[PDB]
Amino acid sequence: ALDKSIVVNLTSRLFADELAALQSKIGSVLPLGDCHRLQNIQALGLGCVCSRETSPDYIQIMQYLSKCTLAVLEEVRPDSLRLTRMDPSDNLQIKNVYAPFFQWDSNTQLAVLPPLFSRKDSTIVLESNGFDIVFPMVVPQQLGHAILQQLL
Amino acid sequence: GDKAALADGHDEIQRTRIAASLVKIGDKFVAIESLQRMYNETQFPCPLNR
Amino acid sequence: MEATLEQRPFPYLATEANLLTQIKESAADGLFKSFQLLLGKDAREGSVRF
Amino acid sequence: IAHGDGRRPNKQRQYIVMKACNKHHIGAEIELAAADIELLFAEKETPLD
């Protein structure tokens, strides 16, 4: 019917440290750039719109996310990632990790929000490839509205 | 003794016959290609024209 | 009254000279009038009627 | 070198170097138009067919 797997080519070998950050999050949600099978590292993370040096807003980033497709990590091999892909309707398996924890149940209600608690928790750094990767955090929509409620 | 166990496949392949270009300079034979016939024909820019 | 282009499926003939250098730029800027540019899925024999 | 100078002699040495592989990926893209695809399995009638 379909195959949904986005491999990521990687120009340099990873370190031993930056395996362990990616090893710590084996299952997560990052909005990559464009629909493909193969992809450069400068389109994976959210960091194309939220760099280090430029002041990000907290509106455009959220606004940026509705355009991007969304993906779930499978492996970390040292020269290649491996990401599975989300359709506009598909029954996948997600396994949440995200560190300011909130317990879920069946029949729950989720929003994918920008990292608004700790960027050092989110933005794991890649000194090898010189391009940081930002992870956004899924939030239950009781608080998925409530963060924007405080923000405005 | 180490020689046959160093190139474990590369002793026994049938020897083929190739056309290309050569030159003798010093004592080292240098082959010369130019990958443009595979790269002009598609309008992907050739990576030798840096 | 002038002979215009058409996409009828013809029994093509295999030539020998390449016609691949200086092309995808060229038809974009009119090397010759009355071209036709097809992309991807439309490299097929069209529907025939009479 | 074994040599008799005022310098104290040196050591036998040994080096071991770590090397490994690099992965690469290649695409290719085929489109087949769905007006074409099925009529491999068509209804199979006419001498025009």
d(CA B36, CA C44): 29
Q: Which one of A7, A37, A79 has the shortest CB-CB distance to D22?
A: A79
Q: How is A28-97 classified by DSSP, letter by letter?
A: -EEE-SSS-SS--GGGTSGGGTS-SSSPP-SSHHHHHHTTS-EEEEEEEETTEEEEEE--SS--------
B33 touches chain C (CB under 8 A): no
Angle in degrees, CA B39, A13, A121, rounded to 5: 120
A38 touches chain D (CB under 8 A): yes
d(CA A48, CA A132): 9
Q: Which of A76, A78, A55, A71 is nearest to A128 (CA)?
A: A78
Q: Which of A138, A151, A146 is nearest to A29 (CA)?
A: A138
Q: What is the largest CA-CA distance in chain A?
A: 44
Q: What is the dihedral of CA A150, A138, A14, B46, to 10 degrees?
A: -90
* B contact chains, 3+ CB pairs < 8 A: C
d(CA A52, CA A63): 19
d(CA A73, CA A83): 4
D31 and C44 within 8 Å at the Cβ level: the answer is no
- Window 1-50 of C, Cβ < 8 Å to B: 18, 20-21, 23-25
B40 and C20 within 8 Å at the Cβ level: the answer is yes
